[PDB]
Design a protein around this ligand. Structure first.
Ligand SMILES: CCS(=O)(=O)N1CCC(C(=O)O)CC1
Length: 182
């Protein structure tokens, strides 16, 4: 509808796949080469389905901060025959607050879904499903089951992936440039 939705669509159309684990179907963001991200509660194993194709997992790392606190991000390297467009230059370098974000989802249940979530707070600590979690972003939208893995963008920046909600607020794990150096 406007330039926020423009940037979100550009990310969805080239840098997302549908990931399926034994815990469900997730929006999955491809970042560069064969490297993608998914919420850690997806419980990625040795095999994952990517757009309904059986795919070997070459590596999966559940990220934690240097206090050994959950970040709710798993970085997955896929045995895929095709690379992602490199979008690492759209990742923030530091923790921050944002205005006018969009949450974008693409699954069998919710194809081509875009939600203007408005202002995003650097919330920090969250007890997420009983697990102490850091680097949480919060937005005042009543997000629902089916949206985990959704991509949070502003114009020009990919800032997080949706990991949970409390019925009135939604929560995303931050993406930082430093997670994807090589
Ligand atoms: C109003 C422009 S924008 O922020 O939506 N956007 C800039 C270039 C983006 C890209 O390189 O993919 C997609 C479009």
């Amino acid at each position: 509808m406007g330039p926020g939705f423009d940037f979100a669509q550009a990310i969805m159309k080239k840098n997302t796949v549908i990931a399926r684990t034994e815990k469900g179907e997730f929006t999955m963001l491809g970042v560069y080469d064969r490297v993608a991200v998914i919420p850690t509660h997806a419980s990625v194993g040795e095999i994952i389905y990517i757009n309904d194709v059986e795919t070997r997992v070459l590596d999966a790392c559940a990220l934690r901060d240097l206090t050994d606190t959950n970040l709710e991000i798993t970085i997955v390297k896929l045995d895929r025959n095709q690379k992602f467009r490199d979008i690492r230059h759209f990742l923030p370098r530091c923790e921050d607050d944002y205005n006018d974000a969009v949450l974008s989802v693409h699954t069998s249940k919710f194809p081509n879904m875009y939600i203007p979530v408005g202002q995003v707070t650097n919330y920090g600590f969250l007890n997420l499903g009983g697990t102490p979690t850091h680097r949480i972003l919060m937005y005042n939208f009543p997000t629902r089951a089916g949206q985990c893995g959704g991509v949070v963008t502003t114009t020009g920046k990919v800032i997080g992936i949706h990991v949970g909600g409390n019925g009135a607020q939604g929560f995303a794990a931050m993406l930082l440039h430093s997670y994807f150096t090589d």
